[PDB]
UniProtKB/Swiss-Prot annotation, chain A:
GO BP field: cytoplasmic translation
SUPFAM superfamilies linked: Nucleic acid-binding proteins, Translation proteins SH3-like domain
GO CC terms: large ribosomal subunit
Highest taxon in the source lineage: Bacteria
Family per record: Belongs to the universal ribosomal protein uL2 family.
HAMAP family: Ribosomal_uL2_B
PANTHER family, A to Z: LARGE RIBOSOMAL SUBUNIT PROTEIN UL2M, RIBOSOMAL PROTEIN L2
Protein name: Large ribosomal subunit protein uL2
Region (Disordered): 182-240
Subunit description: Part of the 50S ribosomal subunit. Forms a bridge to the 30S subunit in the 70S ribosome.
SMART domains xref list: Ribosomal_L2 (SM01383), Ribosomal_L2_C (SM01382)
Taxonomic classification: Bacteria, Thermotogati, Deinococcota, Deinococci, Deinococcales
Swiss-Prot record, chain B:
Region: Disordered, residue numbers: 1-33
UniProt superkingdom: Bacteria
Compositional bias ranges of the Basic residues kind: 1-22
Pfam families: Ribosomal_L32p
Keywords: Metal-binding, Ribonucleoprotein, Ribosomal protein, RNA-binding, rRNA-binding, Zinc, Zinc-finger
Zinc fingers classed as C4-type: ranges: 32-48
A cellular-component GO term for this protein: large ribosomal subunit
GO biological process: one example: translation
Cofactor note: Binds 1 zinc ion per subunit.
Name listed for the protein in its UniProt record: Large ribosomal subunit protein bL32
Co-factor requirement: Zn(2+)
Gene: rpmF
RNA sequence: CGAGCUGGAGAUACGCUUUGACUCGGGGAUGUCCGAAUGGGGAAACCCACCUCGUAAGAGGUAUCCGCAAGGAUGGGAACUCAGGGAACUGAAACAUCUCAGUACCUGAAGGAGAAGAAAGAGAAUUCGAUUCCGUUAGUAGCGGCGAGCGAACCCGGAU
RNA sequence: GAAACGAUGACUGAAUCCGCGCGGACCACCGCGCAAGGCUAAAUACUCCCAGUGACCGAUAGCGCAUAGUACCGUGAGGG
RNA sequence: CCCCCGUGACAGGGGGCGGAGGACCGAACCGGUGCCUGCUGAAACAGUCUCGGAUGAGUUGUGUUUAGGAGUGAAAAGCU
RNA sequence: AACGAUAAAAGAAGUGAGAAUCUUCUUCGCCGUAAGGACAAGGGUUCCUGGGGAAGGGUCGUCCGCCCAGGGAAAGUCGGGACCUAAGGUGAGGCCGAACGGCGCAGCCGAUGGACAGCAGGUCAAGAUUCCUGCACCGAUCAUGUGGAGUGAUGGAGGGACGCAUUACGCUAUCCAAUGCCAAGCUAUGGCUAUGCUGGUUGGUACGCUCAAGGGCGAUCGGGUCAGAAAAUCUACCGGUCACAUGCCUCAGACGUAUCGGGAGCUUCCUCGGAAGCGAAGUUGGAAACGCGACGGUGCCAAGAAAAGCUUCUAAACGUUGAAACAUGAUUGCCCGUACCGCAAACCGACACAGGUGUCCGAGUGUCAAUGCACUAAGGCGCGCGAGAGAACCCUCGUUAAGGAACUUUGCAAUCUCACCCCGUAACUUCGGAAGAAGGGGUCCCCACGCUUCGCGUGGGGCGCAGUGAAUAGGCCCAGGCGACUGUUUACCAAAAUCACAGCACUCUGCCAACACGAACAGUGGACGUAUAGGGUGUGACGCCUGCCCGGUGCCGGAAGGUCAAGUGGAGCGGUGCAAGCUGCGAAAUGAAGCCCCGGUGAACGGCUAAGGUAGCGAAAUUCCUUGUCGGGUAAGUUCCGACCUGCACGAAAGGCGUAACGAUCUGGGCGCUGUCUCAACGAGGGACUCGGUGAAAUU
């Protein structure tokens, strides 16, 4: 427990509620976690400890740089306490090392990957995830994202060797209700158990099931949502 | 509501046929044997306090 | 201005008035705190500062916007004026055009008035000749699910 | 609507006297006027305030108020 | 966590000790299930008896935020 | 009719024009985790004193929370402000916007939280950590001495910084006992005679090689450039050195001495009852916090504010003759709140309303325990109409012959049960549970004996009808529907089979994500997250499962060709003029998405012509005919259980079938008990009736 900014609940913006549900809590805090990890490249550090922190589902490594400063950094599946972390293109592609893709061996399974030089990590970071490399092209690398997708990425971007783990939300069965309350307000409210007024799947004497749409009028099963833009060219194989 | 309720205002008359029975009976005062003021039979004379002798204080 | 005055108050006491009170006119001087409010905070009238002038008491400045600078602006006005935005009931015996209306309401700006104004005009006489207002033309020309219904201008008279 | 002209958000984009606009699509002819700078009394409107008047009222009338937006009601706007 | 017994795939069972739980009984507290009462009420929704919950998705104070076709809603078209 | 809870009241005495209703005394009764006490908020003067006697006070009133007048409230340290920051509010300069205006970093405002200097008493009619008395502490400013030198920021670091449950040890507040101590007297009814009875039985401060559990702890040297923007004699990291034990540092509290106060009562005057002066003892034993020691120990996951004060550290800086710091004096101390009510006739409820209100204190005895239950201290109060009567009927209670659910829509209601020991306890089961299952026994008093003590066991004895002897205080069981479960809901007729839920499934979403709020290429929420994530929809523990039909609609993908907008493209047609020219109309082809079209997809709409019901269940909460038919239980069953099947109109995630456990759920049965009932009776209290006081309503 140490050196972290305070987090405050809030499930809606300026005026009213925006992202339904979510209201419970516990008071959790925020721990600034190094993602971009460049200003520190060129300095070795050791796993002082792996603390378990919320707002993440992902162990947290408390690294210490020769500089003297500490910096929490996601903990990949494997690092024990006391090992070594080193940033900068000059780094043995091992667990915890952060080295851009250009310098990353094909078939190498890494996470914490960015999408644009800096602004921190972005892909592969949530509890146990693995984005492996496919095979450099020109300036961009082909990689496989946890959703089974293929995106070019200019190898200019660092990455962390290895895959996160923090065990696995597989046996975590949240027991009975109220565990969800240890986190977010009573989940989903069956709009089919509301009123013609309140939502599309309202009324009906008895029990319904027609039209299939979201709280508003769109459709939820198999209706595309992404639009026509840039990244679009920079992408390969959305479906599946 | 106020369930039973009257069907019509009652005559000033009717209303009086009624009260033909509310007339007080004046006491039947007796005259105290001593101070001679009037008294209430079987009670003590409030003016002298007697009832043969003087029971109540002056 | 000349016997009275001492507010409404209807009371007592003290008093003040020709070196003319009082009252009426007309200028000054005082004018705590809040309020655009503007030293800073503030759930109005409270709470806290600072710099300068200084006997200390006490005085004064300390807001933002235009401008060297004087100096101007922020606020408030019953209705009237123009502007930006602009309903519906209702009618059409229903209703979507259309009507009710660009009315009601909101907002901005302004003054005692505004707005408008000195013609790339109106008109059919090779006429009038800034703008505005009243009369008339006329409910005519025309607009209109050519339905409900809406409705000019020129000329001519008059304010100026 | 055959529907001109005025206006403007969006694209465009002219001339200048043997020049320019319009006169209800459009053309010629005929005709009236010169746009893209400006300021301007006066007659016009209203009425918080003031005076005068009234085939206006005269106290359940007349303003809500012979005075009070008070008492009273409302968290409040507000009503009164 | 510490001791004793057991074995054919089977386990576990036992004693200490620990102190878990949208665990149990139950008062404050939160609720309001059934009956009577009360309906010109003590009360514009209550009382008595009875009952539900009782470390939990718990109960509550202060400050603060969301509103009208709008907010809020463990969802009755409920509350505002 | 009512006079606002059935916590009662009696007498005496006093005042007065007049008193059930005011005051005094003496009794009675009610509350006592409160109907006592202290605040908060809210209200304001309601507080105190003297008057008053219209109206208000459900009745009187000589009285009052009402009317009149006067008085009362006192803080360097208690709360707040001149200090801090959270949500949130605001916001120069910035981002947006038809207007008004909408957002927004720093900064600022903003407690309900942080920080911070006092205690013990006395006492006005009415105030008190505010006034007095005693002793104390904090800051500030000056003087004096000491000192002998730096002082050290709107900056760095350290720190303030923080959860839930459970738990060891020491202690206190506080409470209990005694042939302890002090004080006062008296005692009689039969006795006691004091080893009886009543009452009191220490708070602050200062010192003490005194006792004392518990609690806290690295310092130092150096290294490195890459860290704290920078700087550092600070902080972090690296390593060296001693960091067993320990050791220190600190002491909750106790004890002793001193001293200051208080202390049951005593005495005196008295204008009637206060005033004044004085004063004893302070023991041993026992219990004990939700507090103190302390930011203690262990365990747990859902993983538990910020900011200033503070500590150290430099920058800059004036200064190293006169510094910072300590001490001893002195002077100094601002604004606001502090009365009274405050779980209630003083606040919210139109009423002095049976309601609503946050926090704290909350004694004793008995009872495993307790903030339960009974009685009761302190203290507070008998509820602002009263008296009689003793009928009908109504409400709230007590008992009830014989019977025992015959009542009735339903055992609705009301009984029975009812605590704590011991013994004993089924099906079924996810092996937890079903269980407090079911059933049976004990329970008081004395004495001896032994025990771990309060307490308890063993034996003997005793008394009653009866011994959790009075109050608190489960009725039990079989079977079925529904829902798994705890939970949630129609404030004021529905609590449930509703909703939610853990679990499952489909699908969308590549991150300025899908999605949503918004005037807005602003801002923001999703998320300071990133696909084992977030959104949406449906299903709803667990278990075995979950079929057939993509014709139609939708969704995805395919995609030749057909069709389709503006626009591009200018022929063809017409106008005017003399003419050049200027002007109307208007194709071919070409031209986006989409629509037609091809295939696909059911835990998509949906159906069982595109197919026709795999399993499982079945007259079921989904069956019409219907009280179907047989069986069950009953003397007798339209209901209920089990089968069958002819499923009017079951059926597999609008989920099918089952399932331990759970239910103020719904249904049927049984045991026990009972006034539910055959039939009601008697009794009680509170109305109803009567008299005195006050005195409505709907209706007409
Ligand atoms: Mg008259
Ligand atoms: Mg007036
Ligand atoms: Mg109970
Ligand atoms: Mg229960
Ligand atoms: Mg009586
Ligand atoms: Mg069944
Ligand atoms: Mg249920
Ligand atoms: Mg429940
Ligand atoms: Mg009477």
């Amino acid at each position: 427990l140490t050196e972290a900014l305070p987090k405050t609940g809030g499930r809606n913006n300026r005026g009213r509620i925006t992202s339904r549900f979510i209201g419970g809590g516990h008071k959790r805090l925020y721990r600034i976690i190094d993602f971009k990890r460049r200003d520190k490249s060129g300095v070795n550090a050791k796993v002082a400890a792996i603390e378990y922190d919320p707002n993440r589902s992902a162990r947290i490594a408390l690294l210490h740089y020769a500089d003297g400063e500490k910096r929490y950094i996601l903990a990949p599946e494997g690092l024990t306490v006391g090992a070594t972390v080193n940033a900068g293109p000059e780094a043995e592609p091992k667990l915890g090392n952060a080295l851009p893709l250009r310098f990353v061996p094909v078939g190498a399974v890494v996470h914490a990957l960015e999408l644009v030089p800096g602004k921190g990590a972005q892909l592969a970071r949530s509890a146990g995830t693995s984005v492996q490399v496919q095979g450099k092209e020109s300036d961009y690398v082909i990689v496989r994202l946890p959703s089974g997708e293929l995106r070019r990425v200019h190898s200019e971007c660092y990455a962390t060797i290895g895959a996160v783990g923090n065990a696995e939300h597989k046996n975590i069965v949240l027991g009975k209700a109220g565990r969800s309350r240890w986190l977010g307000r009573k989940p989903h409210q069956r709009g089919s158990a509301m009123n013609p007024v309140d939502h599309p799947h309202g009324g009906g004497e008895g029990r319904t099931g027609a039209g299939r749409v979201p709280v508003t009028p769109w459709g939820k099963p198999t209706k595309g949502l992404k639009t026509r833009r840039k990244r679009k060219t920079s992408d390969r194989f959305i479906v599946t | 509501a106020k369930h039973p309720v009257p069907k019509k205002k009652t005559s000033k008359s009717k209303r009086d046929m009624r009260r033909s029975h509310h007339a007080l009976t004046a006491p039947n005062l007796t005259e105290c044997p001593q101070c001679h003021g009037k008294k209430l039979s079987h009670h003590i004379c409030p003016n002298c306090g007697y009832y043969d002798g003087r029971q109540v204080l002056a």
